[PDB]
């Protein structure tokens, strides 16, 4: 099961949004190392400003929150730099990833 989950986290990130959240929260460590690999691409995604990569970094964050929801220090440094690498990107000024972002803070 450990790399069953990796294609249908590659597939959640192309209207299945929920049915794919459902799929992978009734399917359940690895997480810890996965979240590293998702922190890093948005943290690149961020510094790749200095105008296509929004959706992804949405479907990024959206997939993030249900992973995180799919389930005692880290969560405040994690938390800290996904608000920082989301208000960094102050460009664009984008409601879709906004949405995400504001949805996986709160979770």
Do not use: H
């Not at 890093?40 to 990569?53: F, I, P, Q, T």
């Not at 959706?55 to 220090?73: C, D, G, M």
């Amino acid at each position: 099961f450990s790399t069953n989950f990796r294609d249908t986290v590659d597939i959640l990130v192309g209207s299945l949004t929920q049915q794919v959240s459902g799929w992978l929260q009734s399917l359940e460590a690895f997480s810890t190392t996965l979240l590293g690999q998702f922190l890093e691409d948005m943290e690149a995604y961020a510094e790749d400003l200095s105008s296509v990569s929004l959706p992804k970094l949405a479907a990024l964050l959206r997939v993030f929150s249900t992973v995180v929801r799919s389930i005692a220090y880290v969560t405040d440094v994690l938390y800290r730099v996904m608000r920082c690498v989301t208000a960094a990107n102050q460009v664009f000024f984008s409601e879709a990833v906004l949405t995400a972002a504001n949805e996986c803070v709160g979770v």
